[PDB]
Amino acid sequence: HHHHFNLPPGNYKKPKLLYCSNGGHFLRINPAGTVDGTRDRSDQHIQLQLSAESVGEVYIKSTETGQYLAMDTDGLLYGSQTPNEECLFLERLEENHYNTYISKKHAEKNWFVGLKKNGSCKRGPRTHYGQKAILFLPLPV
Numbered sequence: 001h002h003h004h005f006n007l008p009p010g011n012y013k014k015p016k017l018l019y020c021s022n023g024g025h026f027l028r029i030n031p032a033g034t035v036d037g038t039r040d041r042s043d044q045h046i047q048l049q050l051s052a053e054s055v056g057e058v059y060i061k062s063t064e065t066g067q068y069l070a071m072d073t074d075g076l077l078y079g080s081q082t083p084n085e086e087c088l089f090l091e092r093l094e095e096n097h098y099n100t101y102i103s104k105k106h107a108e109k110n111w112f113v114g115l116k117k118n119g120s121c122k123r124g125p126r127t128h129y130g131q132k133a134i135l136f137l138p139l140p141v
Contacts, residue, residue: 002108005056005092006092008092008138012049012050012051012058014140015049017041021098022116023115023119025037025038026039027113028043028045029069030045030079031064031065033067034079035069035077035078037115037121047063048060058091058101059087059089060113066081067079068081069089071086071111071113074124075124076121076123085104085105086103086105089101089103090103098137101113110129111125112128112131113127113134113136
C-alpha cells in the first residue's frame with residue numbers, strides 16, 4: 001500500500017453531489033467528456049453514482065450521461081464512456097471528515113481528484129496531501 005486506509009462512512013445506495021469545500025463547486029462531468037466544477041446546484045451533470053469495485057476502491061459515474069470519471073496519463077480528469085484502469089479511485093477519509101479520491105493507477109504519485117477555487121480541476125501532479133482542493137463532501141441529490 002502507498003496510502004492509509006481510513007475510510008469514510010456513508011454508502012453507495014444513492015447518487016451524490018461531490019462538493020469541494022475549496023471554492024464550493026460541485027464536481028461536473030460534461031457530456032463532451034470535459035470535467036470541471038460548478039456552483040449551480042440545478043446542473044444536470046453533477047449527480048454522480050459511486051460504486052465500490054473493491055473495499056475502498058470506487059467508480060464515480062455521471063447518472064445523466066453514464067460517463068465514468070477518469071484521470072489520464074498526464075493527470076487530467078476526463079469522462080470515459082467505458083470503465084478502464086484510469087476510472088478507479090481510492091476513496092478515503094481525510095482530516096477526520098472529508099472524502100478524498102486518489103487515482104488508483106497513479107496512486108504512487110499521490111494524484112488526487114481536486115477542484116480549484118475558480119472551478120477548474122487540478123492536474124494530478126499539482127495535487128498533494130494537505131490541500132483544500134482535494135477535500136470533498138458527498139451531499140444528497
